[PDB]
Write a protein that binds this ligand. Structure first.
Ligand SMILES: NCc1ccc(CNC(=O)[C@@H]2Cc3ccc(cc3)NC(=O)CCN3CCN(CCCC(=O)Nc4ccc(cc4)C[C@@H](NS(=O)(=O)c4ccccc4)C(=O)N2)CC3)cc1
Length: 243
């Protein structure tokens, strides 16, 4: 059952936002070096497959350089039941987009704390103002929560508006989407890249974005940019089917 957490998440009362109800985001992964250091996020989309950002793998083209942590809440004191799995193969998106697939050495064990997120239908366009969630262990820029999994509820901004001069001035492609509060203060940041942007649809969470880049973090009029997952579903499915 993809997209359905067992520990229901909570809204807030990653820069800003709040600490996540522990294990309320069971698809969240921590992408780490062979040495145990968190540097990027990821999303479990199937027991053997993690979706992250291509730029997170810029340092090494070697699957051995990476490990995936599943089911955690703490970044340092990993809980005992935490699943730590090596990566066997890396798949960079073939058109140089900032998205990539990780095939794990062993299929993650599905538990109340480790659950895959659902994928959207091809070419779905998250509507303007849709409130979605981003999560990760990234920088907090003095906002509390360092070391614990944080979340933020952000409104999507349609590309036509996001590309205006007042915002990102034509930098955003159709294969990306924008999200964030234009007054600033709450945003994903370095360390959250490759992590999920999920939207609640009917009764479950759908992976709609991959945290990619931005002009800084939580700055006014500077929403974050995310890879538009719906434009890569067909490629993702082909990779999982043929590998
Ligand atoms: N929700 C906020 C948020 C969450 C998470 C993050 C974490 N992710 C990062 O750190 C990314 C890493 C990266 C991602 C994609 C890339 C290259 C690098 N893709 C290409 O290489 C592909 C080639 N491409 C093609 C087209 N491009 C031009 C058009 C669009 C464009 O201009 N894109 C852009 C602009 C700036 C940067 C990267 C990309 C550098 C840096 N931005 S920053 O201002 O210096 C900064 C940000 C945060 C903190 C401090 C400083 C920035 O984000 N790096 C140029 C190059 C960051 C922000």
């Amino acid at each position: 059952d993809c997209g359905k957490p067992q520990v229901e998440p909570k809204k807030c009362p990653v820069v800003g936002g709040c600490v996540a109800h522990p294990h309320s985001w069971p698809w969240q992964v921590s992408l780490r070096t062979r040495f145990g250091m968190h540097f990027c996020g990821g999303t479990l989309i199937s027991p053997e497959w993690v979706l992250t950002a291509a730029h997170c793998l810029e340092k090494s083209p070697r699957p051995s350089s990476y490990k995936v942590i599943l089911g955690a809440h703490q970044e340092v004191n990993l809980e005992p039941h935490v699943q730590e799995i090596e990566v066997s193969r890396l798949f960079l998106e073939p058109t140089r987009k900032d998205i990539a697939l990780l095939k794990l050495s062993s299929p993650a064990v599905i538990t109340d704390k480790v659950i895959p997120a659902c994928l959207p239908s091809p070419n779905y366009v998250v509507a303007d103002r849709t409130e979605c969630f981003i999560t990760g262990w990234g920088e907090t820029q003095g906002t509390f929560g360092a070391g614990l999994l944080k979340e933020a509820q952000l409104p999507v901004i349609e590309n036509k508006v996001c590309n205006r001069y007042e915002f990102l001035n034509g930098r955003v492609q159709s294969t990306e989407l924008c999200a964030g509060h234009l007054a600033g203060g709450t945003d994903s940041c370095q360390g959250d890249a490759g992590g999920p942007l999920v939207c609640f649809e009917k009764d479950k969470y759908i992976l709609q974005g991959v945290t990619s880049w931005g002009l800084g973090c939580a700055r006014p009029n500077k929403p974050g940019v995310y890879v538009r997952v719906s434009r890569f579903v067909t490629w993702i499915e082909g990779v999982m089917r043929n590998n």
